[PDB]
Design a protein around this ligand. Structure first.
Ligand code: FDS
Ligand code: FDS
Length: 291
C-alpha cells in the first residue's frame, strides 16, 4: 500500500476510556478535518431525528444519500462524519443527509433503527424518489444500513436504488475468523472494545437479534449493495459473511476487499490516496445505480 498508510497507522497506534471520553475524543479528532469552503451544511429536523444536509457545487439536488455514521452505536455525530459525507456528495454528485440517530447506552437497540427508518420515511414524505436515493454507512452505520433496509422492506416502504457499507459491523459477538487472524494487523478494532459497545447497544437483548446483527436478518429483496472492506481488518469476515448472506438471498452484491486497508480507511482520504480512490468508487457505484 501507499507510504501514507504508515502515517495513519502511527496516529492510530497512540491510543479503558469512558463513553463521554470516547465521544469527546472522536469530536476532537474531527476538528482536524478542515470543511472545504464550497460545502453547504443545513441543519434540519428529519421527521423527529436531528439531521444535516451536506451539498457541494456539483450535487444533483434530486439525488440523496442517507448517511449513517459509525461509532459502535455509542459514539459519533453529524460533525464527526461530515468530511466523509461531503467527499461522498462530491464523488456521487448528490446531496447527503447525515442523521444524529439515538446512541447507546442512553438509547439502546432498536432506537438507532427507529431513527434511520424515520429519516428515510421523512425523505419520501418531503418528495425524495427512491430511484434517486441510497443508504450508506460505516462500521456500526454499515450494519445500521442493512438493518434499515430490512425494516423498511418489512413495513412495505419502497427501497432505495442502492446501498453502501464501509467496513460494516454485522456480528455483535465477534466470532468471525478475521477477529482472531487479523487482530495482529488491525490498529483500530479489537474484539474487546467491540463487545463493550455491543453490550451497550443490546442492553441484554440477544446478540443475534436480526435488526441489531443483520448477519441473522432476512436480506431477500434488498437493492444492489457495495461492501468496501480492508484486508487488515478484524471486521473483514463481517463483510465476507454479509456478502455470502446477501448473495444467497438473491441481492446483487459487490464485495471490494482493499488489500492492506484498515477500518474505514475512506475517513483518512485527505492524506490516504486509497481513501480518496475508495470514495471515487462509491461515487461511481451510486451514479451507476441512479442511471
Ligand atoms: O471544530 C470546530 O468547528 C470548532 C471551532 C471552534 C471551536 C470549537 C470547535 C469544536 C471542537 C473543538 C475541539 C474539540 O475537542 C472538539 C470540538 O467539537 C466540536 C463539536 C461541535 O459540534 C462543534 C464544534 C466543535
Ligand atoms: O473486553 C471485553 O471483552 C469487554 C466486553 C464487554 C464490556 C467490556 C469489555 C472490556 C473492555 C472494553 C474496551 C477496553 O478498552 C477495555 C476493556 O477492558 C476490559 C477488561 C476486562 O478485564 C474485561 C472486559 C473489558
Amino acid at each position: 500500500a501507499s507510504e501514507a498508510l504508515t502515517m495513519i497507522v502511527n496516529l492510530l497506534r497512540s491510543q479503558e476510556p469512558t463513553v463521554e471520553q470516547m465521544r469527546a475524543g472522536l469530536e476532537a479528532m474531527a476538528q482536524m478535518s478542515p470543511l472545504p469552503a464550497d460545502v453547504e451544511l443545513t441543519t434540519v429536523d428529519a421527521g423527529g431525528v436531528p439531521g444535516a444536509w451536506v451539498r457541494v457545487p456539483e450535487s444533483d439536488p434530486d439525488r440523496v444519500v442517507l448517511y449513517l455514521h459509525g461509532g459502535g452505536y455509542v459514539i459519533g455525530s453529524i460533525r464527526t462524519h461530515r468530511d466523509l459525507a461531503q467527499r461522498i456528495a462530491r464523488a456521487a454528485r448528490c446531496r447527503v443527509l447525515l442523521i444524529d440517530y439515538r446512541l447507546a447506552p442512553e438509547h439502546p437497540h432498536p432506537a438507532a433503527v427507529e431513527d434511520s427508518t424515520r429519516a428515510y420515511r421523512w425523505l419520501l414524505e418531503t418528495g425524495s424518489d427512491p430511484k434517486r436515493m441510497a443508504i450508506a454507512g460505516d462500521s456500526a452505520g454499515g450494519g445500521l444500513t442493512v438493518a434499515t433496509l430490512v425494516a423498511l422492506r418489512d413495513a412495505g416502504v419502497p427501497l432505495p436504488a442502492a446501498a453502501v457499507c464501509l467496513s460494516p459491523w454485522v456480528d455483535l459477538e465477534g466470532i468471525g475468523e478475521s477477529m482472531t487472524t487479523k487482530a495482529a494487523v488491525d490498529p483500530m478494532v479489537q474484539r474487546e472494545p467491540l463487545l463493550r459497545m455491543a453490550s451497550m447497544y443490546l442492553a441484554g437483548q440477544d446478540p443475534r437479534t436480526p435488526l441489531a446483527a443483520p448477519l441473522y436478518a432476512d436480506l431477500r429483496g434488498l437493492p444492489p449493495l457495495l461492501i468496501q472492506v480492508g484486508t487488515a481488518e478484524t471486521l473483514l469476515d463481517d463483510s465476507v459473511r454479509l456478502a455470502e448472506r446477501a448473495r444467497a438471498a438473491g441481492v446483487q452484491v459487490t464485495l471490494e476487499p482493499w488489500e492492506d486497508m484498515i477500518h474505514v480507511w475512506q475517513a483518512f482520504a485527505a492524506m490516504l490516496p486509497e481513501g480518496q480512490q475508495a470514495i471515487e468508487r462509491i461515487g461511481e457505484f451510486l451514479r451507476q445505480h441512479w442511471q
